[PDB]
Design a protein around this ligand. Structure first.
Ligand SMILES: CCC(=O)SCCNC(=O)CCNC(=O)[C@H](O)C(C)(C)COP(=O)(O)OP(=O)(O)OC[C@H]1O[C@@H](n2cnc3c(N)ncnc32)[C@H](O)[C@@H]1OP(=O)(O)O
Ligand SMILES: CCC(=O)SCCNC(=O)CCNC(=O)[C@H](O)C(C)(C)COP(=O)(O)OP(=O)(O)OC[C@H]1O[C@@H](n2cnc3c(N)ncnc32)[C@H](O)[C@@H]1OP(=O)(O)O
Ligand SMILES: CCC(=O)SCCNC(=O)CCNC(=O)[C@H](O)C(C)(C)COP(=O)(O)OP(=O)(O)OC[C@H]1O[C@@H](n2cnc3c(N)ncnc32)[C@H](O)[C@@H]1OP(=O)(O)O
Ligand SMILES: *C(=O)CCCC[C@@H]1SC[C@@H]2NC(=O)N[C@@H]21
Lengths: 70, 144, 64, 260, 406, 135, 135, 135, 69
């Protein structure tokens, strides 16, 4: 077992007070942060708006990098 | 209960619905003053432009009466031969507090005019209420 | 008070009933005595100003 | 009525104009559409899009033509409803043609409204749905309508392969109305209440002597089994919208997005 | 990453030679390179003299402290020697001078802590650079239609506009109601008060507001407002911040002073900035939008993405008083020859023109206004439009750079 | 599709008829024809007059019959009026869909001059992997 | 290729209404698109009033003719009504005023032929577009 | 901004004065001038010697005034020593901020050489949508 | 209250009145120099100067009591 658990570092609550603590913390706990269906959509990405000199190395290290990074 | 007649109008007609106008300042009013002619009467006349004058409740159409740093006469017993006056002329009675003449000012005045508000700015005096602050700047370099 | 000025007269008593068009106060300002006239019948409630006091525009003289 | 020289009265007048946009040729024609069992151009949009998501563009537009007495009848919207909203929570641009106004024929302002939602879809990279039901060019307006047809076809070619374009055919599309569908990616027809043809049976009879119904000439079964132009033949308008929402569930919003 | 410079200094260190001018040239050249690449913010907290003034001017935002900071190129003593103008360093270069007159400062803090707080507020709206995403706050969008989701604060807009077309109102009453939390960071608040510009959020998205203020010059555009709004718009466009325009403009400010100072050349700056900007651009028209000022303030063919108007909007070539004098000059001549009641005829014709054409519906009929909406819809319409427009591709001809009128 | 996609210089000379949807296909201005010129004999219309006058002047041409008028002649007069008014290049020139109406002999000069002006073009299209031309 | 406008003026056609403003907006948007792409030159040869003035301002070079061309946004009579100053069209907006005071003009020609000569001189230095080299 | 942005060939010829911030604005080397040449008469300095000496020698000019000496003649002697020491092209040439100090007749030669070599410059800015010129 | 108080942190460049002098509302009490500008402080009520606690050349903090009544 290698999960990181909640620790009551001080105090010794009764099982009712444990239940109250858990129901509060569990309903306070954040919802679906970092959502599972964050689609990719590169339409109009800011890197395509920039002017690049025809020989600008940022055409490799910014533009192509940004399109191809997955 | 006064009845005011309306005159016969000219043949011209109103072709504009409104004029845009700059908002009248709420407190500090800043004015451009032509220096003199009697600015040499004073020990330090640049107090006029270095002072945040305060408009007193005594201001009316004859004149606006300020308070601030007193202006000091170079010779405080010196009398002035009365001379013509104009709207916006800044008199300094011998108590040292300036007065800015309004439209109903007397044709001649008895006190030295330290400066006159430029025609650019005189009409702004028409809107300053008691309790407003006034600042003055020389419209062009004062030199004796 | 329609303007800044000095309360040269307060013309009514605290709580006094008043009729529209009577005078509450007189202010010296603009080198002139300006009367303050009651705009409705009512009772002069909480008369907040004293004779010879200076006051600033828009201050309440009384509720009505 | 509230005085129009007042802000409340101007707002009451806006509410009046908006109300008049729901039935621009009178309730009797909406009653005729329902008696024929078809939806109105507005109900087609509101049934396809998610509830309350429809935001309407150029609702109050009216045609500018004065040819042949058209100036005596200027229906609001000029016979097409245009806007955007969501399908399954993803934004789409939409237009829906109203066969009750001049037979749904394309006029100048009708075309400008379609061009506007095309350019909005191409700009924002969102799927475009067109619901087609119109007797071709509005003959009274003349060549202006052909210039608008060219502008619409040119926008369909620009959008081709950039954003998903879907065409629903839900009545008789005649004349120029047929090519915009053919340029879109998918055409969904309704199996007995829609047709597409370039020219009608009377001209076909005159030239060739072939005697044919509109249904045999250009019905949904003809364009499925013979011409290969339709991609689905719905049993009815609800089934067509269900197929369109299924289609959209597979497609990305644009060629620079991943399929969902 | 953003660059913050805090500036005090008596210019070049005179005992060091032209080397100090070389280093100034290098600092200026770096500010030019970084221009439009990273947010640049200058705090001025003392006397910045000589070359110290030009780097702030090249940065994007200038914050000054209202009595302890000054900027000037040439000191009071040289000004006195060359012109006789005897001026204090505060009158010459003070924060109030650079706000109200020169238009150089963007904020005048009441103290140093207030200046830092304003700089942190500014940074909270900006992305770190021109290609990173902007810092959205998490906001939960309520479900249902725009008409189903009207708040009482939205319904307070339906009664805002005075019945008389000429009675002014404070445009902040719109801005603070369409922005989240009423939160609005005004920029150049003390300069060219006839236009209000600044940052806000709509459903967590940063936006730039540009709004005519009826309470100053009746909302007219002038030279100073045109430059104020033009640089703000170009700063938002560099950093991808959508712009929302609140339009209530009767025209340009008439006057020979505006003509001789270049209202043509410097008003064309706001045309350039708005036509060039490729961010999402939403226009809400509240009352007037006349003549060339309609073109300037967010017209559709200047590439406004969504234009909505309130029922009180008035979109016309000119006010009916001026328009009738052309459009009916025939009938007015005939009535003058016949000795008719020409003034009563002019009133009849004017009210006919106002009822017929001085309204939003002609522009709606021509498609220049995408919808006419109840004022209370405005917040929902603007948020929904920005959510639609959050991604745009726009084609522009390839160029090295533009040639904006300077 | 092929015409609207093509980005080379596209010049259109209209001789005689250009009706309806075939005007749209054959090099219309809004399909991106760079220069459109017409001969005086061009006929640009939604449809031929014999069809248009059956649709315009409807009802009018039937109350004439209920009043017992010789609608067989009236319809020919309506056709001649429609053709004299609308079946010509000038309505499209007035809308700027035809850039010039030229004597036919001018065609070689106009084509050569247009191609020489259009020899360099930048036209910008939305980014795509490829089109989806109807197959 | 370079664009030359010979602006003459009188503003929007007031009878046509807001459509004239939308067409101004479109003309300005094209001047901005073209800005820095092709050389744009404006010759002013009459009273450019109202909307007519912003297009020259957006072009790269403005050539005015001395005694016979003017630019102003709003006319002397509206200026008189608001500001109270009497001014003539020449004093308000003449070529001298836009050279010496407003800084909007680039040349003040002694006549229309001199203006054409100066425009040809400008074009002799300018390339056809930003992708070409100067002659 | 305009000078620092410009990526065409940039040549500067200095003929007498280039003082203070105007040195920076008028084509300084570190602003990216491609060729800088100075005539023998050039004068490149942080400020004019009057102003510089009054500041640099503040100690001596106060001390001599408290001694009651001929401060005016001392100021003239210090100003002459400063002008002869620092107000010349040579301190900038020593720093390399001027690439050559040239006989004035060489100016056209150096200019033509630079313009012939720099007709293509391989230089670039950081990528941006556009700059944010102070406006 | 009856206290005349300094509106700003500044130096008293001129005292206009003495204790037991009668004053009227709006009469000048002191002038304060700050930021190179000189600013009047004036009597808020009719009365007579008492509790006078400042002198010419004194630098005073904002809110300093100058006098009473
Ligand atoms: C592009 C090249 C072209 O010229 S294409 C022109 C195509 N013209 C036609 O097809 C003529 C229209 N007649 C038809 O029968 C159509 O095919 C349609 C309407 C699709 C058949 O539908 P159906 O259910 O039979 O209706 P209907 O024909 O009885 O409808 C008559 C009402 O619609 C109108 N209408 C119709 N087409 C046009 C048109 N092109 N221009 C103007 N108006 C048109 C009719 O005037 C009539 O409306 P109303 O009752 O007179 O007010
Ligand atoms: C292109 C940029 C240029 O040409 S710089 C030319 C202008 N510089 C000046 O030195 C005069 C203008 N301003 C000043 O110097 C004033 O001191 C300012 C900055 C306005 C502030 O005045 P104040 O606070 O009274 O300072 P101060 O004159 O007593 O000087 C304090 C200490 O700083 C020094 N200092 C000041 N300026 C410079 C300078 N430019 N170069 C070198 N040192 C400078 C003074 O010498 C003095 O140091 P110290 O007390 O003598 O040890
Ligand atoms: C956004 C743009 C606007 O708001 S422009 C609003 C104001 N329009 C103007 O009239 C421009 C300014 N006016 C002037 O100073 C002068 O009248 C101008 C037009 C510059 C020169 O006119 P001028 O040479 O004196 O001729 P004129 O007054 O005798 O008129 C001759 C014919 O031109 C016509 N005209 C003129 N301007 C317009 C206009 N803007 N719209 C429509 N028509 C216009 C006049 O009606 C007159 O026609 P007619 O010959 O009398 O039949
Ligand atoms: C009110 O106090 C202002 C008085 C201004 C007019 C009077 S008249 C008599 C004095 N002589 C003069 O010139 N002004 C004073």
């Amino acid at each position: 077992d290698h999960e990181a658990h909640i620790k009551v570092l001080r105090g010794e609550p009764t099982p009712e007070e444990m239940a109250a603590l858990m129901a509060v913390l569990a309903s306070a706990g954040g919802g679906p942060a970092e959502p599972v269906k964050k689609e990719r959509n590169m339409w109009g990405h800011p890197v395509d708006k920039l002017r690049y000199s025809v020989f600008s190395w940022q055409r490799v290290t910014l533009l192509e990098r940004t399109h191809m990074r997955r | 209960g006064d009845v005011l007649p309306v005159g016969e109008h000219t043949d011209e007609f109103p072709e504009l619905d409104q004029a845009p106008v700059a908002a009248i300042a709420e407190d500090v009013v800043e004015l451009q003053v032509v220096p003199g002619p009697r600015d040499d009467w004073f020990v330090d006349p640049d107090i006029l432009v270095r002072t945040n004058w305060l408009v007193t409740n005594r201001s009316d159409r004859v004149g606006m009466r300020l308070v601030g740093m007193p202006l000091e006469y170079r010779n405080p017993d010196r009398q002035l031969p009365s001379e013509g006056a104009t709207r916006g002329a800044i008199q300094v009675p011998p108590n040292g507090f300036p007065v800015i003449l309004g439209p109903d000012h007397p044709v001649t005045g008895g006190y030295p005019v330290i400066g006159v508000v430029t025609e650019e700015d005189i009409d702004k005096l028409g809107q300053v209420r008691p309790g407003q602050t006034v600042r003055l700047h020389w419209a062009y370099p004062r030199r004796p | 008070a329609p303007m800044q000025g000095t309360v040269v007269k307060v013309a009514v008593e605290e709580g006094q009933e008043v009729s529209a068009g009577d005078l509450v106060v007189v202010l010296e300002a603009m080198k002139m005595e300006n009367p303050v006239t009651a705009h409705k019948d009512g009772t002069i409630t909480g008369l907040a100003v004293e004779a010879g006091a200076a006051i600033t525009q828009g201050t309440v003289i009384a509720e009505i | 009525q509230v005085d129009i020289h007042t802000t409340a009265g101007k707002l009451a007048d806006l509410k009046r104009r908006t109300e008049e946009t729901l039935h621009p040729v009178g309730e009797a024609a909406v009653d005729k559409v329902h008696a024929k069992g078809k939806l109105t151009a507005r109900e087609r949009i509101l049934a396809l899009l998610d509830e309350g998501s429809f935001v309407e563009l150029d609702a109050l537009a009216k045609h500018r033509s004065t040819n042949f007495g058209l100036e005596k009848n200027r229906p609001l919207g000029d016979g097409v409803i245009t806007g955007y909203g969501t399908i399954d929570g993803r934004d789409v641009c939409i237009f829906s043609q109203d066969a009750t106004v001049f037979g749904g024929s394309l006029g100048e302002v009708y075309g400008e409204k379609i061009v506007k939602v095309q350019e909005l879809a191409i700009k924002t990279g969102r799927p475009l749905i067109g619901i087609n039901d119109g007797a071709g060019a509005r003959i009274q307006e003349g060549v202006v309508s052909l210039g608008l047809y060219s502008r619409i076809f040119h926008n369909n070619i620009k959008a081709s392969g950039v954003i998903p374009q879907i065409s629903l055919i839900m009545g008789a599309a005649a004349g120029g109305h047929v090519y915009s569908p053919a340029l879109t990616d998918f055409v969904v027809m309704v199996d007995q209440t829609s047709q597409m043809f370039i020219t009608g049976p009377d001209v076909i009879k005159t030239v060739t002597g072939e005697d044919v119904t509109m249904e045999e000439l250009g019905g949904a079964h003809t364009h499925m089994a013979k011409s290969g132009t339709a991609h689905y033949v719905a049993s009815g308008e609800q089934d067509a919208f269900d197929y369109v929402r299924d289609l959209l569930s597979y497609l990305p919003p644009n060629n620079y997005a991943d399929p969902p | 990453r953003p660059l913050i410079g805090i500036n005090d200094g008596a210019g070049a260190r005179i005992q060091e030679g032209v080397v100090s001018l070389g280093l100034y040239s290098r600092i200026f050249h770096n500010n030019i390179k970084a221009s439009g690449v990273i947010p640049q913010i200058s705090l001025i907290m003392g006397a910045a003299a000589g070359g110290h003034v030009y780097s702030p001017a090249l940065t994007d935002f200038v914050v000054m402290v209202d009595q302890t900071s000054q900027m000037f190129i040439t000191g009071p003593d040289v000004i006195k020697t060359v012109t006789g103008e005897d001026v204090t360093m505060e009158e010459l270069g003070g924060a109030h001078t650079h706000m109200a007159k020169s238009g150089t400062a963007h904020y005048v803090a009441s103290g140093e802590q207030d200046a830092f707080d304003y700089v942190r507020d500014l940074l909270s709206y900006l992305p770190p650079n021109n290609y990173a995403d902007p810092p959205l706050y998490p906001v939960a969008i309520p479900e249902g239609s725009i008409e189903e989701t009207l708040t009482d604060e939205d319904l307070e807009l339906d009664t805002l506009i005075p019945d008389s077309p000429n009675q002014p109102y404070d445009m902040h009453e719109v801005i603070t109601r369409i922005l989240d939390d009423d939160e609005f960071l005004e920029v150049q608040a003390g300069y060219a008060g006839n236009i209000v510009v600044g940052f806000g959020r709509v459903e967590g998205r940063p936006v730039g507001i540009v709004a005519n203020q009826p309470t100053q010059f009746a909302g007219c555009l002038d030279i100073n407002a045109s430059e104020k709004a033009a640089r703000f718009i170009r700063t938002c466009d560099c950093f991808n911040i959508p712009i929302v325009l609140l339009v209530d403009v009767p025209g340009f400010l008439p006057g020979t002073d505006q003509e001789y100072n270049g209202i043509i050349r410097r008003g064309a700056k706001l045309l350039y900035a708005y036509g060039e900007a490729t961010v999402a651009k939403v226009t809400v028209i509240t009352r007037k939008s006349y003549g060339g000022a309609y073109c300037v303030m967010g017209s559709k063919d200047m590439g406004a993405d969504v234009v909505v108007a309130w029922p009180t909007a008035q979109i016309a070539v000119m006010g009916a008083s001026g328009a009738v004098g052309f459009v009916y000059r025939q009938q007015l001549k005939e009535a003058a020859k016949n000795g008719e009641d020409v003034d009563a005829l002019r009133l009849e014709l004017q009210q006919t023109y106002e009822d017929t054409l001085v309204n939003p519906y002609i522009a709606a009929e021509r498609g220049y206004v995408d919808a006419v909406i109840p004022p209370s819809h405005t917040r929902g319409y603007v948020a929904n439009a920005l959510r639609l427009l959050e991604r745009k591709i726009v084609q522009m001809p390839p160029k090295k750079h533009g040639n904006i009128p300077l």
